[PDB]
């Protein structure tokens, strides 16, 4: 068996532990966006037509 | 008391170089052992860093 943990390695964790860590990352990363936001828009204005034409 | 004392005179040369040859070989069990321990942490030290 391994015991609370083995010998005092602990051990054969090179197999354990080197097959895993993992790979974490860890990936502290990929979450939620706020997006952002676009804004308007350019007129002055005038009259021409329409004026005549109404 | 003087037989003890040539009992002594004649033999205690080997029953002292004896002891301390008793006393010799318990010593280089002791360090043998204490040379044989590093090695079972050292294998343990292995194991622990490879699987880092």
């Known amino acids: 068996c391994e015991e609370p943990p083995a010998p005092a390695p602990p051990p054969a964790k090179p197999k354990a532990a080197a097959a895993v860590p993992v790979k974490a990352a860890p990936t502290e990363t990929?979450?939620?966006?706020?997006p952002?936001?676009?804004?308007?828009?350019n007129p002055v204005g005038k009259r021409d037509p329409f004026r005549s034409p109404i | 008391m003087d037989?003890?004392?040539d009992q002594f005179v004649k033999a205690p040369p080997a029953i002292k170089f004896?002891?301390?040859a008793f006393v010799v070989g318990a010593?280089?069990?002791?360090?043998?052992?204490?040379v044989i321990?590093?090695?079972?942490?050292?294998?343990?030290w292995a194991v622990a860093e490879?699987?880092?």
């Open chain 1, 30 to 34: 990929g979450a939620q966006a706020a």
């Open chain 1, 36 to 41: 952002s936001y676009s804004y308007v828009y």
């Open chain 2, 50 to 52: 490879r699987r880092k």
């Open chain 2, 27 to 34: 010593l280089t069990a002791a360090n043998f052992f204490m």
């Open chain 2, 18 to 20: 004896g002891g301390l």
């Open chain 2, 3 to 5: 037989k003890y004392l």
């Open chain 2, 37 to 44: 321990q590093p090695t079972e942490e050292e294998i343990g």
